[PDB]
Copies of this chain bind each other. A is one copy, B any other.
Amino acid sequence: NIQDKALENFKANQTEVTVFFLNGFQMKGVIEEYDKYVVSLNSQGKQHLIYKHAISTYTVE
């Protein structure tokens, strides 16, 4: 399972992820927790509850 091992790894290491949204929007932060439908991203120190259906890509480097 690539999705979970990936999110798990982002979460455990607290890596700075860039999240790209379907509509073109992007946001950088840290994944704090996630389940099947949502991802909780801490960005600019503030919490965001994001639906996976709204997400295109997670990017890191």
Chain A interface (Cβ < 8 Å from any Cβ of B):
1-3, 6, 21-25, 27, 33-38, 40, 45-61
Q: How far is the CA of A35 from the CA of B12 in the complex (A)?
A: 21
A52 to chain B, nearest CB (A): 7
Copies, count = 6
A54 to chain B, nearest CB (A): 4
Residue on B nearest A49 in the bound complex, by CB: B58
- B59 contacts A56, CB within 8 Å? no
Q: How far is the CA of A25 from the CA of B23 in the complex (A)?
A: 10
Residue on B nearest A46 in the bound complex, by CB: B61
Cross-chain contact of A3 among B6, B49, B54, B56 (Cβ < 8 A): B49
Q: Given A22-B22, A22-B23, A48–B37 Cβ distance below 8 Å?
A: no
